[PDB]
């Protein structure tokens, strides 16, 4: 039914420009305005602007007047948001949202497009183990990769309970770091194989690290 489908995630070097699509399905594209808002994990939602699909007329938020350009294609029924002069605080999730008179409240929203602003280059994560000495806690420091995301599964999906995978942190290098840690009965090491399988699809990386101790 009512569906907005935007483009995939994108990585930008600072000062470039990014163009996010948003395809509608399940309603009359020409009859309902399209809002663009954004969400950075340092604040809440930031409205970017409003476009009328039938006309193409726009009005942008005061914060973005100039850098943002909203357009549309009636044939393929797609709205486009283009943000330019990308500074490092423009990395965020970008949402298009359909407006259902003077009733402006947005529904439904798109899947969101993650746009990262950084000059770091694609890089595989280096995996290091977190071995336990004296229940027991074992872990996996996946370190210095770009860009996000990474997938961590223990034991090729065997061990799942007690597993805690931490959100990634952006280091001063511009690369990300995250750890995954699972608690296991202490007697099980010395008997059971506990492998940390990480994969990074951006940068052709498939690493397996046996996490054993002492």
């Amino acid at each position: 039914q009512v569906q907005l489908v935007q483009s995939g995630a994108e990585v930008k070097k600072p000062g470039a420009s990014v163009k996010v699509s948003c395809k509608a399905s399940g309603y009359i594209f020409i009859s309902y305005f399209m809002h663009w808002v954004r969400q950075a994990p340092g604040q809440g939602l930031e409205w970017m602007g409003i476009i009328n699909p039938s006309s193409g007329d726009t009005r942008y938020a005061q914060k973005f007047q100039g850098r943002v350009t909203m357009t549309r294609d009636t044939s393929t029924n797609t709205v486009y948001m283009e943000l330019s002069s990308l500074r490092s605080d423009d990395t965020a999730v970008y949402y298009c949202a359909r407006r259902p008179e003077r009733h402006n409240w947005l529904d439904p929203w798109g899947q969101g497009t993650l746009v990262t602003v950084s000059s770091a280059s694609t890089k595989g994560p280096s995996v290091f183990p977190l071995a336990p000495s004296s229940t027991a806690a074992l872990g996996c420091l996946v370190k210095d990769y770009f860009p996000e995301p990474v997938t961590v599964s223990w034991n090729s999906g065997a061990l799942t309970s007690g597993v805690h995978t931490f959100p990634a942190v952006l280091q001063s290098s511009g690369l990300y770091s995250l750890s995954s840690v699972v608690t296991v009965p202490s007697s099980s090491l010395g008997t059971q194989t506990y492998i940390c399988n990480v994969n990074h699809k951006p940068s052709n990386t498939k690493v397996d690290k046996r996490v054993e101790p002492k």
Partner: protein, 213 residues
Amino acid sequence: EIVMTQSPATLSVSPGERATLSCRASQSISSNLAWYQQKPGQAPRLLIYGASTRATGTPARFSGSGSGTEFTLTISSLQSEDFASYYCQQYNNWPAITFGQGTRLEIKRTVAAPSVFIFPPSDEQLKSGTASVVCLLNNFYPREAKVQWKVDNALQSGNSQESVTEQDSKDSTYSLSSTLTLSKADYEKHKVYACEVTHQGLSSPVTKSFNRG
């Protein structure tokens, strides 16, 4: 130029009780306000509009009162799927809309003291120029926890990073990790590496430490 300010930034309440958030406007927006719920990794979904009118599919425990400058969303009888983030939004003058900062709703549970662990740098990472000591705070509640690093009793400042996970699904607790990164030269120059955890579920701080070797 109309600003919406969200009630408290975070709220923890036990499942099944009552939850009250309050959106505030600098300018009187008359009625003219919507609410959104958003789960992590997902887009916001519409909840109420016109301050009080539930959206299609919005269950009856969600209600909202308003008119003027100060508004309120209320969830009677919390539920598992309601713990999320909630945003208010204004449309006082037609095309211009501004959102709130947000209020994250959390599950209130019993106090749980963290199980602490410390991990030295792995002998594969020292071959480069870095060393990482990792302190884990497993399955604790509430969120508030103060971890400090000390090397040779020298209290570290601005060289660790903290990351906290989302509230566990089966236990409703949190886990936290403090990663201290040093140069290998700085690492092998010191012996005792200690991570001290302060938490309201702890009679006294829990210090977990190790020696280089």
